[PDB]
Amino acid sequence: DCSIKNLASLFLETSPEEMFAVCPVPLFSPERIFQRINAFMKRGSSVSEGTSIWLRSPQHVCNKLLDKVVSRDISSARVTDEIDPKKNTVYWHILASCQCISASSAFAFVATNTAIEIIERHIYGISEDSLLIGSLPFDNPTPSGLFFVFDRVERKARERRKSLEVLKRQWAGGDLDLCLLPDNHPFNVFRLFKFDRMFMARSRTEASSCGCQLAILVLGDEEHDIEEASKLYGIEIQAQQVMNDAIVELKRRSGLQAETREHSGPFTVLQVHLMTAIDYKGFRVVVFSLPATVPRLLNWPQPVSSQLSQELAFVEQRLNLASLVKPQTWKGSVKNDEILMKTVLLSLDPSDDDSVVFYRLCFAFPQMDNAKLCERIRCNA
Amino acid sequence: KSLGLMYNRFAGAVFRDASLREMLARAAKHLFLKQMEVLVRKKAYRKVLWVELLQTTIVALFNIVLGTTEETRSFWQEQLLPEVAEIFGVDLVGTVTPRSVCHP
């Protein structure tokens, strides 16, 4: 069990006691939610025959769990003598929002799992096999993964790699294959600077057949230093949280309006974009969510009556601002020089354009100054 | 366009601020057309979307003519009132500080 098990009684005069008598205070254990969030997987529609990837990817999954949070709302919710499930009871909705944040946190644990193995297997591992002492001649090789000793040390090294494999298994995924993603991929819309390094990471385990976490390692761009390239991703992460707060209001109000009015197309094309920054040993190895198809930049000259222009006007009037995305026209190709100073519309979907995400919102808040581009006015300010 | 001569000869207050209101209404009409000249010169209708560009110029003009902020008093004394002198022919720059006809 270890669950609430039908939150009933609670009649407003019960006691200060009888609250701590029938409840846990992990009210939902982190086993019950994860044995029904794998239902949010195999029950789903549009799975064709067996082939899902983008549907089961955590980018899409946390969005549909958000579309289940917005569904049947608070004002008509009822507690107490509502033992029948599948109705608008608060026990259902606290169960539903706990699925939403568990989808975000499961992305976060896989985030820090992928994070450590990028920076150790390709950067800090060629110089970790030896070279503890710098008074001895320190000759560390350059990282090419990015583009006879005594018997006692040898046997304790075999003990080291065998025991660290136990660390790499169990809690973490049971080892993972890597891809290097050379500097011509159209995933460069995820990329800001020319000297950044991309790393797809599959599961290489039984998993839930999802895998697909790509990461970007910050290194700089010529006169932009490595601290500059890292910190601009940092203000990017802290800025997407605020638009994530404006956008979950867009799910809420458009869902509330479309439910109550039409109980007598898609839900919203401004879906929530999930990221995680790390700050391990010396680098920030920020991880995105991998799309099944290529990201294409959307031109902002758009129909007035279209969906994307319509509910961007709601997100805008909440943020107390003006036009975020400038008028852009995107024929094809890239430039890779003079890094893009404007926010863009990524449109991550194999299907019709009913799921877009925002990116480069760091270049929407001004450069502040009094001119270095890490120093910005704060997004919440 | 000869309302400026009436403003000098009007003695009563209701006729004075009515002519003054008419000249300032025609003034913001002329500065809206002057800014519209800039937006047709700089060929912006090819890049920025047209009708909302018209709307954001209108709400910028109304917030800068009617206002309780310092940008309103600076915009009046520098652009609106000197343009009143050229099209209505009276030099009223310096005596019609914006808390005189600020009413709706």
């Binding site: 007035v304 009556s305 319509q310 006007a313 | 009708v51 909302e52 018209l54 709307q55 209108i58």
Partner: peptide, 27 residues
């Protein structure tokens, strides 16, 4: 919906000021 807001057309047509309807009321 967000394409018609604000502006309305001011039309200044050519009612002739010599018709019998205007001339009777003016005089």
């Amino acid at each position: 919906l967000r394409t018609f807001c604000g502006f309305f057309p001011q039309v200044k047509t050519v009612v002739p000021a010599s018709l019998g309807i205007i001339r009777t009321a003016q005089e």
